[PDB]
Amino acid sequence: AQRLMQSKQTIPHYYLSIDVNMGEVLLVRKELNKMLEGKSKISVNDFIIKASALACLKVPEANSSWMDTVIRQNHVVDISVAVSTPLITPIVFNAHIKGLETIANDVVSLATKAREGKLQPHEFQGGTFTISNLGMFGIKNFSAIINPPQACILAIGASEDRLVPADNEKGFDVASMMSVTLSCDHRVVDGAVGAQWLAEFRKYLEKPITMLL
Amino acid sequence: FTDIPISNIRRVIAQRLMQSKQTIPHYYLSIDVNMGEVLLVRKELNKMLEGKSKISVNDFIIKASALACLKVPEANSSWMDTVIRQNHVVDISVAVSTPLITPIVFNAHIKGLETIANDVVSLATKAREGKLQPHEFQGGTFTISNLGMFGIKNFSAIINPPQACILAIGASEDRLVPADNEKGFDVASMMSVTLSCDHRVVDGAVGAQWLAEFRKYLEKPITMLL
Amino acid sequence: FTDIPISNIRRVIAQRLMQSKQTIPHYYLSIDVNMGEVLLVRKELNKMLEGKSKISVNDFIIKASALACLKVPEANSSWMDTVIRQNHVVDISVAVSTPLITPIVFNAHIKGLETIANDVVSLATKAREGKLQPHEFQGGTFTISNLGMFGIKNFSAIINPPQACILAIGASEDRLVPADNEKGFDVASMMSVTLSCDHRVVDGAVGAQWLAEFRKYLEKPITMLL
Amino acid sequence: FTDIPISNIRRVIAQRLMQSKQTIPHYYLSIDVNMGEVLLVRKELNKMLEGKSKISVNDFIIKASALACLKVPEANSSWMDTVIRQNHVVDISVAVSTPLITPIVFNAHIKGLETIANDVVSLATKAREGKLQPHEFQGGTFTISNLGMFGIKNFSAIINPPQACILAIGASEDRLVPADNEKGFDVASMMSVTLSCDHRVVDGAVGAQWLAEFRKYLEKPITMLL
């Protein structure tokens, strides 16, 4: 509670939100999972980890961390993933380097240890970024609370089918949307640079082929 | 008739070629890789780049081979007396014709596909039109040589003294492939890939695994996300 | 990075293999053999056996190569200083992957096709999960190594020190072959066979005869009755 | 079993063959050449010859290789210590099976196509049933070895000590080639060509140029007029 309250009253929060098309992602997931052949399961959340991680490299300002009299900058992106615990934030190191499937193995092992065991204190403290997912409970959109040292945090809603105008004789088709909400420390993340990171994240996720960079 | 004195630059090269070839026993492997999927991917990437930079088919080979080395670390290792030296990082060296030099691309298993294309262009331009610092082209952990630009179907190369593997790349062809169509066939593009291995380190079975793994990565570029 | 000390087993193989390649000159050959007739015969033999044992496609290669050695005894010989040694019996050594060992099948030119299948299975089981007597895998008069199980199209292999020839077998494939049909073609399975010969003993002409003779035996299994 | 003493004729061949492989590094190249046009030209000339002389498909290779050497003089050179010897003439040596000798055809880049056919026939007749002067068959500036008459698809050959290149020729096949017809293909003959080069003198780039230049001459016998 102390950290949560302090973070809110010391860090001025301002939020952004967009809608990301997930039609292309599901097609890729069917192939990869098929390629895995049961070796590993790649969740839709796993694509979010790498897509956000690479977006941090292209926009390093969002990955930074505010300190008094000096703005600390991080060239590595250790992304922390929030998981419900009867709430803990395990850390995935070098999210901008390691492969897509190894992230899935890492998150599964950490989640199992988190829910049914003890984590070493450094393994869930001092992350350079945070991602929290609530789509499993049907939440359309929400805003989160940032960690004290960090500068941004992602919020992910549930995916749903929405009509999209099309050139079809019928004039439309069905595409699965989802809403992404980002909370930024306005001292470090300006409106323009924050918009660039969220727009850059959309382009990576809207076409998984571009994730090869 | 005419006699031409040897240059000192070529002298060392000759020494290395002969020595590396003779000291190391070389056994060669070869396969054929389908290029239908890569060309489709290259069209999408180059279109989305909107002229910022161009990704060559050779750029896909660099990353695909680099990830294959991680999955089969034996091919990425090096041989020394009384110790087999294992390399955890992959520094792929790309051969380019020079009136022959081997610029080194560091961390090919980590850096993105597009940055590889920028790196190879800058190094190649510097190699042809200028001077390279000696470390920049000495001590690679792997080597790739491309001759498909001259119409060579297939060939075999000569390894560097410290390395353990080297790829040989032929030209992209157009060959009939049996299919389930009413015509029973369709046109598909194939490239032959030849690998030369030091049999002291790389056995037949492990060498086959690396080459087969390389085929799977290149035959479906989506899997390069791993 | 990581350095691995070399085991004596690797050390014995390394110096044995390196000496063979740096001493024996190697010239190679390659042909394509049709598998249309072989597969049909395998279906009949395996069916009639009613599950007693399974005859592998590799087993047909053993006898077909063995009978080819009888018709071309020059390839079956062995090089010694000041005297070329000729072998009348044909002991064929088959290479099997081992985390690489070469069990020896004796009198391959005499024993029947099915007994070869039983022999190769028993030896391979002992090779992977047991101890084999040295002679049982030393001093073979011929060598066959198969890598078709890993998708390798074609490759060349190193020779043993005392031997004179070695067969390299690629993976079976499906390739179009021109025909007199209204479509002008039909689908027929092919495979590439690569032979490495010591040019001191095996000349180009005699080497071609052995490989061509091997094709005729394997292209029509009825002819293996001799 | 049987032991055979080594003859001195095979003995003198041995060291020359022994020294060549362990002293000259070896790298090989390979392509596929369409032989469709040549056959059409051969029918006309043989007709024109009216039985006066016969022109084999091998005869076209002699002149095509000879003219290729003029356009790429590096492949025609010879490696000496501390000096790269250069040849402005192309004395092509043709290999013929002998119960293996290399008759030399002098000035192959100058003399006419039919005169080569008469020369190769007379020399082969003198070689097999007669005696030849050592020079007549020693000191060639280039070598061509043919094994397509036995059905070999492709092979690689050992290089002579003083030379820098050697050609290997496979058998003429029949392969499907994609076309613009309503059937989408047509039958066209092919011929695999393998070139073996000393890597000290012949780099990959210059070697590819010679093989490609040889390819262009052979696809269209009109171009041999230079």
mmCIF file of N, CA and C in Angstrom, chain B residues 130-195:
data_model
loop_
_atom_site.group_PDB
_atom_site.id
_atom_site.type_symbol
_atom_site.label_atom_id
_atom_site.label_comp_id
_atom_site.label_asym_id
_atom_site.label_seq_id
_atom_site.Cartn_x
_atom_site.Cartn_y
_atom_site.Cartn_z
ATOM 1 N N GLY B 130 37.800 1.656 -49.174
ATOM 2 C CA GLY B 130 38.634 2.178 -48.107
ATOM 3 C C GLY B 130 39.429 1.149 -47.333
ATOM 4 N N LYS B 131 39.688 1.446 -46.061
ATOM 5 C CA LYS B 131 40.523 0.620 -45.201
ATOM 6 C C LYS B 131 39.699 0.094 -44.036
ATOM 7 N N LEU B 132 39.839 -1.199 -43.754
ATOM 8 C CA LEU B 132 39.199 -1.799 -42.593
ATOM 9 C C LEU B 132 40.218 -2.054 -41.493
ATOM 10 N N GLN B 133 39.841 -1.716 -40.267
ATOM 11 C CA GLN B 133 40.686 -2.017 -39.123
ATOM 12 C C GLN B 133 40.858 -3.532 -39.019
ATOM 13 N N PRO B 134 42.070 -4.018 -38.729
ATOM 14 C CA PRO B 134 42.342 -5.460 -38.865
ATOM 15 C C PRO B 134 41.402 -6.369 -38.089
ATOM 16 N N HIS B 135 40.958 -5.969 -36.896
ATOM 17 C CA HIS B 135 40.086 -6.837 -36.111
ATOM 18 C C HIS B 135 38.715 -6.987 -36.760
ATOM 19 N N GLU B 136 38.301 -6.000 -37.559
ATOM 20 C CA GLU B 136 36.972 -6.016 -38.162
ATOM 21 C C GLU B 136 36.772 -7.145 -39.163
ATOM 22 N N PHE B 137 37.845 -7.781 -39.641
ATOM 23 C CA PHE B 137 37.714 -8.881 -40.588
ATOM 24 C C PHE B 137 38.561 -10.093 -40.209
ATOM 25 N N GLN B 138 38.977 -10.208 -38.950
ATOM 26 C CA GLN B 138 39.787 -11.326 -38.484
ATOM 27 C C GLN B 138 39.130 -11.942 -37.258
ATOM 28 N N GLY B 139 39.051 -13.268 -37.235
ATOM 29 C CA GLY B 139 38.563 -13.973 -36.064
ATOM 30 C C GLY B 139 37.068 -14.197 -36.017
ATOM 31 N N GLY B 140 36.449 -14.500 -37.155
ATOM 32 C CA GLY B 140 35.032 -14.802 -37.157
ATOM 33 C C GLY B 140 34.737 -16.183 -36.606
ATOM 34 N N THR B 141 33.530 -16.327 -36.057
ATOM 35 C CA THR B 141 33.077 -17.622 -35.566
ATOM 36 C C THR B 141 32.332 -18.423 -36.625
ATOM 37 N N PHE B 142 32.058 -17.824 -37.779
ATOM 38 C CA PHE B 142 31.345 -18.492 -38.858
ATOM 39 C C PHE B 142 31.621 -17.720 -40.140
ATOM 40 N N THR B 143 31.334 -18.356 -41.272
ATOM 41 C CA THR B 143 31.602 -17.733 -42.559
ATOM 42 C C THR B 143 30.519 -18.124 -43.553
ATOM 43 N N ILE B 144 30.053 -17.133 -44.309
ATOM 44 C CA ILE B 144 29.094 -17.336 -45.384
ATOM 45 C C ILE B 144 29.650 -16.693 -46.645
ATOM 46 N N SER B 145 29.677 -17.458 -47.733
ATOM 47 C CA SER B 145 30.155 -16.970 -49.019
ATOM 48 C C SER B 145 29.061 -17.174 -50.053
ATOM 49 N N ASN B 146 28.758 -16.123 -50.809
ATOM 50 C CA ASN B 146 27.680 -16.147 -51.787
ATOM 51 C C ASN B 146 28.258 -15.980 -53.183
ATOM 52 N N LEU B 147 27.871 -16.877 -54.090
ATOM 53 C CA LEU B 147 28.265 -16.804 -55.491
ATOM 54 C C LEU B 147 27.073 -16.913 -56.432
ATOM 55 N N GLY B 148 25.850 -16.773 -55.917
ATOM 56 C CA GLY B 148 24.679 -16.905 -56.766
ATOM 57 C C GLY B 148 24.525 -15.772 -57.760
ATOM 58 N N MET B 149 25.193 -14.644 -57.511
ATOM 59 C CA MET B 149 25.100 -13.508 -58.422
ATOM 60 C C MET B 149 25.764 -13.784 -59.763
ATOM 61 N N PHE B 150 26.563 -14.843 -59.863
ATOM 62 C CA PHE B 150 27.267 -15.177 -61.092
ATOM 63 C C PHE B 150 26.719 -16.422 -61.777
ATOM 64 N N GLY B 151 25.581 -16.943 -61.322
ATOM 65 C CA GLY B 151 24.958 -18.080 -61.968
ATOM 66 C C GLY B 151 25.467 -19.439 -61.546
ATOM 67 N N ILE B 152 26.310 -19.512 -60.513
ATOM 68 C CA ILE B 152 26.823 -20.802 -60.067
ATOM 69 C C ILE B 152 25.708 -21.588 -59.393
ATOM 70 N N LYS B 153 25.464 -22.805 -59.884
ATOM 71 C CA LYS B 153 24.431 -23.646 -59.290
ATOM 72 C C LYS B 153 24.836 -24.122 -57.901
ATOM 73 N N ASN B 154 26.053 -24.641 -57.767
ATOM 74 C CA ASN B 154 26.514 -25.192 -56.501
ATOM 75 C C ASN B 154 28.033 -25.241 -56.520
ATOM 76 N N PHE B 155 28.628 -25.126 -55.335
ATOM 77 C CA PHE B 155 30.077 -25.142 -55.206
ATOM 78 C C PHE B 155 30.444 -25.482 -53.770
ATOM 79 N N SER B 156 31.737 -25.707 -53.552
ATOM 80 C CA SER B 156 32.282 -25.964 -52.228
ATOM 81 C C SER B 156 33.397 -24.967 -51.950
ATOM 82 N N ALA B 157 33.523 -24.560 -50.693
ATOM 83 C CA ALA B 157 34.459 -23.521 -50.296
ATOM 84 C C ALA B 157 35.587 -24.112 -49.454
ATOM 85 N N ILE B 158 36.475 -23.231 -49.000
ATOM 86 C CA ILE B 158 37.607 -23.591 -48.155
ATOM 87 C C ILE B 158 37.469 -22.851 -46.833
ATOM 88 N N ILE B 159 37.675 -23.568 -45.740
ATOM 89 C CA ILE B 159 37.415 -23.056 -44.401
ATOM 90 C C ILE B 159 38.573 -22.182 -43.943
ATOM 91 N N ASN B 160 38.287 -21.307 -42.984
ATOM 92 C CA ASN B 160 39.344 -20.558 -42.325
ATOM 93 C C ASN B 160 40.046 -21.450 -41.303
ATOM 94 N N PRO B 161 41.316 -21.187 -41.004
ATOM 95 C CA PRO B 161 42.069 -22.054 -40.081
ATOM 96 C C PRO B 161 41.409 -22.204 -38.718
ATOM 97 N N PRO B 162 40.866 -21.141 -38.106
ATOM 98 C CA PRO B 162 40.299 -21.306 -36.761
ATOM 99 C C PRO B 162 38.844 -21.748 -36.699
ATOM 100 N N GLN B 163 38.084 -21.633 -37.782
ATOM 101 C CA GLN B 163 36.658 -21.920 -37.743
ATOM 102 C C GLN B 163 36.391 -23.418 -37.888
ATOM 103 N N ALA B 164 35.104 -23.773 -37.871
ATOM 104 C CA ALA B 164 34.679 -25.162 -37.953
ATOM 105 C C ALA B 164 33.609 -25.417 -39.005
ATOM 106 N N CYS B 165 33.031 -24.375 -39.597
ATOM 107 C CA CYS B 165 32.013 -24.536 -40.626
ATOM 108 C C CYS B 165 32.063 -23.354 -41.582
ATOM 109 N N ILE B 166 31.526 -23.567 -42.781
ATOM 110 C CA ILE B 166 31.422 -22.513 -43.785
ATOM 111 C C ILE B 166 30.334 -22.908 -44.774
ATOM 112 N N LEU B 167 29.463 -21.954 -45.093
ATOM 113 C CA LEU B 167 28.353 -22.195 -46.003
ATOM 114 C C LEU B 167 28.720 -21.793 -47.424
ATOM 115 N N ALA B 168 28.201 -22.544 -48.391
ATOM 116 C CA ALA B 168 28.343 -22.231 -49.806
ATOM 117 C C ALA B 168 26.955 -22.082 -50.408
ATOM 118 N N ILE B 169 26.720 -20.962 -51.085
ATOM 119 C CA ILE B 169 25.395 -20.592 -51.566
ATOM 120 C C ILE B 169 25.427 -20.532 -53.086
ATOM 121 N N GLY B 170 24.517 -21.266 -53.725
ATOM 122 C CA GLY B 170 24.386 -21.238 -55.164
ATOM 123 C C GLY B 170 23.374 -20.210 -55.634
ATOM 124 N N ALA B 171 23.056 -20.286 -56.923
ATOM 125 C CA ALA B 171 22.100 -19.362 -57.512
ATOM 126 C C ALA B 171 20.682 -19.910 -57.411
ATOM 127 N N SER B 172 19.717 -18.998 -57.339
ATOM 128 C CA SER B 172 18.311 -19.373 -57.254
ATOM 129 C C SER B 172 17.824 -19.828 -58.623
ATOM 130 N N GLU B 173 17.221 -21.010 -58.675
ATOM 131 C CA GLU B 173 16.764 -21.591 -59.926
ATOM 132 C C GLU B 173 15.241 -21.557 -60.016
ATOM 133 N N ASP B 174 14.727 -22.135 -61.096
ATOM 134 C CA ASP B 174 13.303 -22.384 -61.269
ATOM 135 C C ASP B 174 13.118 -23.829 -61.707
ATOM 136 N N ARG B 175 12.549 -24.647 -60.825
ATOM 137 C CA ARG B 175 12.448 -26.077 -61.060
ATOM 138 C C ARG B 175 11.016 -26.534 -60.844
ATOM 139 N N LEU B 176 10.587 -27.483 -61.670
ATOM 140 C CA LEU B 176 9.264 -28.068 -61.513
ATOM 141 C C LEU B 176 9.207 -28.910 -60.245
ATOM 142 N N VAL B 177 8.087 -28.816 -59.537
ATOM 143 C CA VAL B 177 7.875 -29.567 -58.302
ATOM 144 C C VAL B 177 6.526 -30.267 -58.401
ATOM 145 N N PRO B 178 6.448 -31.569 -58.119
ATOM 146 C CA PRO B 178 5.159 -32.263 -58.219
ATOM 147 C C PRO B 178 4.144 -31.689 -57.242
ATOM 148 N N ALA B 179 2.888 -31.639 -57.680
ATOM 149 C CA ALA B 179 1.822 -31.060 -56.877
ATOM 150 C C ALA B 179 0.537 -31.835 -57.118
ATOM 151 N N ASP B 180 -0.514 -31.429 -56.409
ATOM 152 C CA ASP B 180 -1.820 -32.067 -56.507
ATOM 153 C C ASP B 180 -2.752 -31.371 -57.491
ATOM 154 N N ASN B 181 -2.243 -30.432 -58.286
ATOM 155 C CA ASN B 181 -3.074 -29.733 -59.253
ATOM 156 C C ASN B 181 -3.521 -30.681 -60.362
ATOM 157 N N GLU B 182 -4.476 -30.211 -61.169
ATOM 158 C CA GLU B 182 -4.907 -30.991 -62.324
ATOM 159 C C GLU B 182 -3.769 -31.180 -63.318
ATOM 160 N N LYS B 183 -2.813 -30.251 -63.347
ATOM 161 C CA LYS B 183 -1.595 -30.429 -64.126
ATOM 162 C C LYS B 183 -0.562 -31.285 -63.407
ATOM 163 N N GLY B 184 -0.722 -31.502 -62.103
ATOM 164 C CA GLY B 184 0.169 -32.350 -61.344
ATOM 165 C C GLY B 184 1.467 -31.711 -60.903
ATOM 166 N N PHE B 185 1.668 -30.422 -61.165
ATOM 167 C CA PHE B 185 2.930 -29.773 -60.838
ATOM 168 C C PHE B 185 2.715 -28.269 -60.756
ATOM 169 N N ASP B 186 3.733 -27.582 -60.241
ATOM 170 C CA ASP B 186 3.763 -26.129 -60.186
ATOM 171 C C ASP B 186 5.214 -25.669 -60.171
ATOM 172 N N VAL B 187 5.420 -24.398 -60.498
ATOM 173 C CA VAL B 187 6.764 -23.838 -60.573
ATOM 174 C C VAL B 187 7.164 -23.291 -59.210
ATOM 175 N N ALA B 188 8.336 -23.706 -58.732
ATOM 176 C CA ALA B 188 8.870 -23.240 -57.462
ATOM 177 C C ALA B 188 10.357 -22.961 -57.616
ATOM 178 N N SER B 189 10.852 -22.009 -56.831
ATOM 179 C CA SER B 189 12.246 -21.589 -56.888
ATOM 180 C C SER B 189 13.042 -22.305 -55.807
ATOM 181 N N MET B 190 14.199 -22.839 -56.184
ATOM 182 C CA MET B 190 15.053 -23.596 -55.281
ATOM 183 C C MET B 190 16.461 -23.021 -55.301
ATOM 184 N N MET B 191 17.148 -23.106 -54.165
ATOM 185 C CA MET B 191 18.567 -22.794 -54.080
ATOM 186 C C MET B 191 19.283 -23.958 -53.414
ATOM 187 N N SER B 192 20.427 -24.344 -53.969
ATOM 188 C CA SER B 192 21.242 -25.386 -53.366
ATOM 189 C C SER B 192 22.228 -24.775 -52.380
ATOM 190 N N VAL B 193 22.313 -25.375 -51.197
ATOM 191 C CA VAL B 193 23.199 -24.914 -50.137
ATOM 192 C C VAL B 193 24.182 -26.028 -49.816
ATOM 193 N N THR B 194 25.471 -25.699 -49.836
ATOM 194 C CA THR B 194 26.531 -26.661 -49.571
ATOM 195 C C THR B 194 27.307 -26.217 -48.342
ATOM 196 N N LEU B 195 27.513 -27.140 -47.408
ATOM 197 C CA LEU B 195 28.193 -26.856 -46.152
ATOM 198 C C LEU B 195 29.460 -27.693 -46.055
#
